[PDB]
Amino acid sequence: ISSFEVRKATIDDYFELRNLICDVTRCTETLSREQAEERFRYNTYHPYCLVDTENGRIVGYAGFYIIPHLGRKNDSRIEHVIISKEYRNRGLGRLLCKQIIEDAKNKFNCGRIDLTVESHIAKKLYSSLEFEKVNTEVMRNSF
Amino acid sequence: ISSFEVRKATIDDYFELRNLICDVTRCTETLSREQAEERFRYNTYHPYCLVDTENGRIVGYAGFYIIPHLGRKNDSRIEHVIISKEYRNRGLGRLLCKQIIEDAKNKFNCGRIDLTVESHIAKKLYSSLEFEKVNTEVMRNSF
Ligand SMILES: CC(=O)SCCNC(=O)CCNC(=O)[C@H](O)C(C)(C)COP(=O)(O)OP(=O)(O)OC[C@H]1O[C@@H](n2cnc3c(N)ncnc32)[C@H](O)[C@@H]1OP(=O)(O)O
Ligand SMILES: CC(=O)SCCNC(=O)CCNC(=O)[C@H](O)C(C)(C)COP(=O)(O)OP(=O)(O)OC[C@H]1O[C@@H](n2cnc3c(N)ncnc32)[C@H](O)[C@@H]1OP(=O)(O)O
Ligand SMILES: O=P(O)(O)OC[C@H]1O[C@H](O)[C@H](O)[C@@H](O)[C@@H]1O
């Protein structure tokens, strides 16, 4: 009977969000308030977090990004969806993304959502939400 | 001996860019002045065009997008790279990307640049610019 709420992440959650991402992810930097303010005020970046209502704690995070397109509805992407190791395999990853996916379709009027999966849990998550194989090749230049 | 210049695309170029972008890509819409103005004011979206200095025409386009990150240098992506059928295989595809790639590294302090490619010409261009194949799986939810 544990309550949860999906909500937009904020600057006041920076360090708790950073502890969640950097517990599972490749982190290299701790932002100042001026840098953090900059990244949160990029108007294409929509950080979602998932909160436990019982203890006010953030337990999930997902980064949603608008990719503007000229001549079509904007594209978008989901990167860095993370659920607290404690809370996994309970439907909160699905709960979080479904809120994202509906905001993309009808709140931001996007034409599509793109993502890279590389996981095993992840691929079975997004297939279950109508993400289908895209027949491209990803390439990366790392600095 | 034709001179060219890379510059940031602007609203005043909307219809000339749309004619260029929509020939190889899947366009569905032509934006109003308010929608177009809105998309040009997304502060992660850096539309690059390449102009023929001789005849003021836009002959190339590439979309550069910042992907904000918490705890790391920002990511970025290159989408919609096209050179006019007339101007190809002359080094203008490389010229455009190298300006972007240098602005990503040292103007926006990105950690990496991501992209998806499909045609042969394209993949050989970015491999020659230190893009390496990632071997992930791209998925899409299309609305
Ligand atoms: C940036 C990228 O490339 S995408 C991936 C980014 N982030 C990560 O992988 C972080 C590490 N992993 C996690 O945090 C979580 O496991 C996530 C985010 C992948 C999924 O979050 P969860 O809360 O565990 O997922 P949830 O409980 O909603 O289940 C999602 C679907 O995936 C499946 N699934 C979830 N966990 C597992 C598991 N351990 N084993 C097999 N299947 C699983 C489920 O079948 C589920 O569908 P179902 O409930 O109808 O059966
Ligand atoms: C992220 C994305 O946008 S991917 C989608 C790619 N965009 C498109 O396909 C739109 C249609 N095609 C084009 O607009 C252009 O052909 C581009 C953008 C792919 C390349 O632009 P160009 O101006 O022709 O490239 P440029 O003259 O700089 O040479 C690019 C490299 O690609 C290769 N290349 C170029 N043309 C060819 C060709 N006809 N056949 C084989 N290789 C070629 C070469 O290796 C060349 O390197 P080099 O000059 O050292 O020999
Ligand atoms: O899905 P489309 O809009 O038709 O795009 C086709 C796509 O081909 C490649 O993957 C490029 O990286 C994209 O920038 C381009 O848009």
Author numbering:
A (entry chain B), B (entry chain A): 2 to 144
Task: Give passages from the manuscript.
GNA1 catalyzes the acetylation of glucosamine-6-phosphate (GlcN6P) to generate N-acetylglucosamine-6-phosphate (GlcNAc6P), which is needed for the biosynthesis of UDP-GlcNAc, a required precursor for both GPI-anchors and N-glycans. Apicomplexan parasites have a hexosamine pathway comparable to other eukaryotic organisms, with the exception of the glucosamine-phosphate N-acetyltransferase (GNA1) enzymatic step that has an independent evolutionary origin and significant differences from nonapicomplexan GNA1s. To further characterize the enzyme and, given our inability to express and purify sufficient amounts of active PfGNA1 (10), we used CpGNA1 as a surrogate, considering that it belongs to the same Apicomplexa-specific GNA1 family and can be purified fairly well with a high yield. CpGNA1 is found as a dimer, as is the case for other reported GNA1 crystal structures. CpGNA1 adopts the typical GCN5-related N-acetyltransferase (GNAT) fold previously described in GNA1 enzymes, though with some variations (see below).
The dimeric structure of CpGNA1 in complex with acetyl-CoA and glucose-6-phosphate (Glc6P) from data at 1.95 Å in space group P212121 was solved by molecular replacement with Phaser using the monomeric structure, and further assessing ligand binding by representing unbiased sim-omit maps. Note that Glc6P was used previously as a pseudosubstrate to get insights into GNA1-GlcN6P recognition and catalysis. The CpGNA1 structure consists of a central twisted four-stranded antiparallel β-sheet surrounded by four α helices. Remarkably, the highly conserved tyrosine of the active site, also present in CpGNA1 (Tyr127), establishes a hydrogen bond between its hydroxyl group and the thioester sulfur, leading to an increase in the electrophilic character of the carbonyl group of the acetyl-CoA molecule during catalysis. Note the proximity of the Glc6P OH2 that mimics the amine group of GlcN6P to the carbonyl group of acetyl-CoA (distance of 3.45 Å), which clearly supports that the same mechanism might take place for CpGNA1. There are 19 residues of CpGNA1 engaged in the recognition of acetyl-CoA and Glc6P. The adenine moiety and the dimethyl group of acetyl-CoA establish CH-π and CH-CH interactions with Ile122 and Ala123/Leu126, respectively. The phosphorylated ribose, pyrophosphate, pantothenic acid, the β-mercaptoethylamine, and the acetyl moieties are tethered via hydrogen bonds to the Arg95 side chain and Lys125 backbone, Asn90/Arg91/Gly92/Gly94/Arg95 backbones, Ile84 backbone, Val82 backbone, and His81/Val82 backbones, respectively. The Glc6P is tethered via hydrogen bonds to the His81/Thr117/Arg27 backbones and Arg73B/His81/Arg113B/Thr117 side chains.
